[PDB]
Amino acid sequence: TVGAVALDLDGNLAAATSTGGMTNKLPGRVGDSPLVGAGCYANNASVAVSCTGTGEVFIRALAAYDIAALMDYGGLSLAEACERVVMEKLPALGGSGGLIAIDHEGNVALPFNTEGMYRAWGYAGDTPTTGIYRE
């Protein structure tokens, strides 16, 4: 699974997610990656999110939209919503993985509950950060 989120100079948010799925998966199985609100979501009013992880649990929990709804309706910060979904709700359903998120205010979050997540981010005109492991 791969993905990207961005906020542009016009204040527009977008998200994309693409995957090969799982080694040895049953032909015809669909994970969260192509499912609006599960593996991918963007709304200028809220957040853009791309997910990666145990797809079934990201579908059951509507992980990407759940971030948006927690912020929009619950008034959670990006960091608070990311903690709630990735560190609490997904593990409670036996899910592992992570996501990237940017909110309408340009806050960026790359939560994961796994050993690693291949990731990077950067502000326009600023130096990029890369990461593989925790910490």
Binding site: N12, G20, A48, I100, Y118, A120, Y123, A124
Partner: protein, 154 residues
């Protein structure tokens, strides 16, 4: 203000099994793609074009399980899925179970921009993309020795 983030998959990425040289190949690939995104956003390109290009590059990168370097199914086949969403209009496009499209994220952008639909699957998705001039590829192009060995090992 403008900002991009990307990922190449979350999972049990093992430090014990990696050399620094292997890790640097991932850092180099992530850095190159996030820098392309930053440059595009600095230049006033849209968030939708920035995420589409960043994902096409992660698909192109054989180090990541999307596009080239796609994992094998139980049947030693490739089935690829993608989605893109525009936070301005809340339009979305997605394909699932496509095997003959080099870049799934571009087929998903094609669904968003060149159909009234949000999600197309399988041979119908492929036929819709071919009717709009996207090229047919053999799913063989996605295959890498590395991913084929992870299938044999499983």
């Amino acid at each position: 203000k403008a900002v991009i983030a990307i990922h190449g998959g979350a999972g049990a990425i093992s430090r014990a099994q990696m050399s620094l040289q292997q890790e640097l190949r991932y850092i180099e690939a992530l850095s190159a793609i996030v820098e392309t995104g930053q440059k595009m956003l600095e230049a006033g390109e849209s968030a939708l074009d920035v995420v589409t290009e960043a994902v096409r590059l992660l698909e192109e990168c054989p180090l990541f399980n999307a596009g080239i370097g796609a994992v094998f199914t139980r049947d030693e086949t490739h089935e690829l899925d993608a989605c893109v969403m525009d936070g301005n209009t809340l339009k979305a496009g997605a394909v699932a179970g496509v095997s003959h499209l080099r870049n799934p994220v571009l087929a998903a952008r094609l669904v968003m921009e060149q159909s009234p639909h949000v999600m197309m699957i399988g041979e119908g998705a492929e036929n819709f993309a071919f009717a709009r001039g996207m090229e047919r590829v053999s799913p063989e192009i996605f295959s890498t020795s590395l991913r084929y060995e992870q299938l044999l090992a499983a």
